[PDB]
Design a protein around this ligand. Sequence first.
Ligand SMILES: [Mg+2]
Ligand SMILES: [Mg+2]
Ligand SMILES: [Mg+2]
Ligand SMILES: [Mg+2]
Ligand SMILES: [Mg+2]
Ligand SMILES: [Mg+2]
Ligand SMILES: [Mg+2]
Ligand SMILES: [Mg+2]
Ligand SMILES: [Mg+2]
Ligand SMILES: [Mg+2]
Ligand SMILES: [Mg+2]
Ligand SMILES: [Mg+2]
Ligand SMILES: [Mg+2]
Ligand SMILES: [Mg+2]
Ligand SMILES: [Mg+2]
Ligand SMILES: [Mg+2]
Lengths: 88, 117, 237, 104, 70, 67
Amino acid sequence: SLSTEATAKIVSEFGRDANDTGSTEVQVALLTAQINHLQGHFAEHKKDHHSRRGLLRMVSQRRKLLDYLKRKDVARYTQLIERLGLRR
Amino acid sequence: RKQVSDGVAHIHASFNNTIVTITDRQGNALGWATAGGSGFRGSRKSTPFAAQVAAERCADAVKEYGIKNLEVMVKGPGPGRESTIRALNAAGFRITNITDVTPIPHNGCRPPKKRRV
Amino acid sequence: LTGRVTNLTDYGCFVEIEEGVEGLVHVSEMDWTNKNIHPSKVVNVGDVVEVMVLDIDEERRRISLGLKQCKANPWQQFAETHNKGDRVEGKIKSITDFGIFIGLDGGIDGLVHLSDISWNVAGEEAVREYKKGDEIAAVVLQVDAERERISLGVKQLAEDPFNNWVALNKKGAIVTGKVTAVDAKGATVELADGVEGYLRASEASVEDATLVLSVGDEVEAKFTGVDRKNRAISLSV
Amino acid sequence: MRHYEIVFMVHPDQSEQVPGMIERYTAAITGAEGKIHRLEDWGRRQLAYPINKLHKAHYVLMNVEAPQEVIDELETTFRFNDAVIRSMVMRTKHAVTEASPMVK
Amino acid sequence: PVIKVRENEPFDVALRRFKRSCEKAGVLAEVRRREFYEKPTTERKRAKASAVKRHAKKLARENARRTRLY
Amino acid sequence: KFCRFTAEGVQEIDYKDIATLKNYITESGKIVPSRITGTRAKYQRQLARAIKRARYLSLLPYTDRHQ
RNA sequence: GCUUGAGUCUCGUAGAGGGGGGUAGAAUUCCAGGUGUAGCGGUGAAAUGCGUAGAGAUCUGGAGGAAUACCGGUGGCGAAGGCGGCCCCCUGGACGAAGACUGACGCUCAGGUGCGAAAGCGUGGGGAGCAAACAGGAUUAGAUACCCUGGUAGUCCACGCCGUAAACGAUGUCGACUUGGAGGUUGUGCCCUUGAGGCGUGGCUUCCGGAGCUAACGCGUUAAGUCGACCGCCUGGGGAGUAC
RNA sequence: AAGGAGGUAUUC
Ligand SMILES: [Mg+2]
Ligand SMILES: [Mg+2]
Ligand SMILES: [Mg+2]
Ligand SMILES: [Mg+2]
Ligand SMILES: [Mg+2]
Ligand SMILES: [Mg+2]
Ligand SMILES: [Mg+2]
Ligand SMILES: [Mg+2]
Ligand SMILES: [Mg+2]
Ligand SMILES: [Mg+2]
Ligand SMILES: [Mg+2]
Ligand SMILES: [Mg+2]
Ligand SMILES: [Mg+2]
Ligand SMILES: [Mg+2]
Ligand SMILES: [Mg+2]
Ligand SMILES: [Mg+2]
């Protein structure tokens, strides 16, 4: 999965400080990074249904986090989806 | 016709029959005897006594070579599988080593279907 | 003498010749032509073998025995048959990072240094050209019967266009070539198939020859020197 | 960097090339900025069963810290070289710097 | 199950030693098992039944060391 | 009983230690069950992997009659 | 707003979880030789079959395909189907210890989408063993079967389709509460580790059993007990999971 | 296959 160094880098970008590991923006960025990483894996392994089931949870969970964020703070939702290059 | 005095007796002990073949260390056969060709058919062919008589015939149709020391290799879960070793020992042969050489696949080919008798 | 094998080891065979007398037959003394036959396959423990006493160590109570002398050395057979410079065809037994071992007739393994296969192909295509078991013809460069090695060479089967190029163009000829590479230190100019000359920036025309020489330009430069070590023809305009 | 334990068996007829093979492979890791943590030449050893009609293979053990790419090239070299009868490279979670039971 | 015939031991001893060695290897049982093909469900089912009866026997045996049957 | 490895707190069985593994393979060369030896389950799995790796390297024999 | 539900991060652990690529040894089959000679094979008993053009047996070499003995375990992992040599690469989940962070972000889910044993279908490969159909020999009153000798599809690979099983724990998912015992497996804390000890505390799992429940059998903290949220389904047997 | 012993089986 995501490396120990790559998680620290993302937390720094999207959080108030180094220890803000659970903010919604940080969580969405981490899920996005792993989702974007895995597309290369599934280009070569179409038949990896077991791994793709875990990929769906990441996609589905990012949807739930984004919906919560949109409801609670539209401004950060707009800002975050632009920064992460997402639709909806 | 030559003289060896050290050979190897391969016993093939199948369920239905018992083949004894005596050979040199190199693997060139000297003689062979079977229970089915020793005067036993069907229910009697697959008996320990029949294998003993097969061992007698093989030890009698090979002593032109003057074998004195013998090595015994048993293969298969046959009926006799043992009377052959005893018969060889009694026929005037020194048994040096006994080895079980029954082939065991390490989970290879699929065996035939079970008999629904 | 005739003796009975008492013990067989991978480094030698113990043959009891007399009561209480065991001589050691080296596996190197077991066969001239196939140095790589394990004793377990030629002789069994208890076999009666005719062995010749080569050396007796009274002090250490060990007799070096020869089965070697009953058979025939293929190295002498090779030296009588093949003079220095003989062309021998043989099968590639194995490919190694340093060279090819080639089995010749008589069970001899010849070693070809990889440096003699081609003057112009670095490293990777030479390994793909030869498959294990392929038949290759090489000329016997040197037979060392003392170390039991034959050095074989492929260089004598080809004819270097480099050598023909240098012989055709005497020192001082002006030669025209197309620039294949341009460096800050000089330009690499191909003058013939496999024959490349080097025209230095200080002799190309300015601190950088790239302002004067483009990749692919034809440059007329004088053949001033040949570097036989690097195949580098030093050129000057 | 991933840590790999590399055991390969060289044909006994090339026991004289074992120093050269060790130097060549060692440089091919050190040049790729990896480390070498253990080098053991167990030497000529009797085989439990014949491998390619041989007994008495030469054993070399290497414990290495190197990236996956250079190790990949190393394994391909083993395949192409016909002096190594067998080779096994295993991933290890941490380095080792102790004599093997074979040396002891 | 290789057997080397030692000196001074009778051939009966040699035959006894070989028989015990084969039994320890369990070759005959393996051959009898491999005579016919047993479906994975059957092999899986048979293994389960042995465990169930074996466990029941232990617990029943445990009760016998307690219940006054005398 | 008396699982030997857990007594010494061995982290990993280390296939290279042939002297130890000879205890856990039979005369024919197949592995002895943990029920007989007394080894714990976790060490048993490590022991099986170690023996299988040793067989591949020909430190140990698969069967008694390879040749 | 809050931190107790749900998540995130830090360190580890166990595992036949998945996909791709290598490789190892045993064994079966066929082929090429050496030895050797008259049987082999099969059955309750036989015959069909193979064999003097040399079988079977034995030794050596080679080719190929498939599966991975022992370990192996009411052991493990996975949502289920299922997953078992070894090694590498890519990858999913679960659990534990301590701490920090977000601040209800949750549960269930019609339709929808996906996965889904075996058999089967399509295109193209592969084919050692096994084996529907089929051929033959027997048994039988008959034998379109059971048994024997052969044997095609198929089983294997790649890519699509199919979408069903006693797909079963015949037990929908999520949460809370309610006496005990013996174990298995995997973490972790403490004490004298005196020497594999003792004492706690998490996860998953097998058996027994109390109250209670049940028509009874039985279930019994992993409930079929006490409750709460949401969903699927039942309405006598046949006709019929059939017709349109 | 038949008979005796030990255990859930071994530390030894
Ligand atoms: Mg994740
Ligand atoms: Mg049959
Ligand atoms: Mg058949
Ligand atoms: Mg589970
Ligand atoms: Mg639906
Ligand atoms: Mg199918
Ligand atoms: Mg098909
Ligand atoms: Mg087809
Ligand atoms: Mg049939
Ligand atoms: Mg249904
Ligand atoms: Mg099922
Ligand atoms: Mg069920
Ligand atoms: Mg149902
Ligand atoms: Mg109960
Ligand atoms: Mg219908
Ligand atoms: Mg139906």
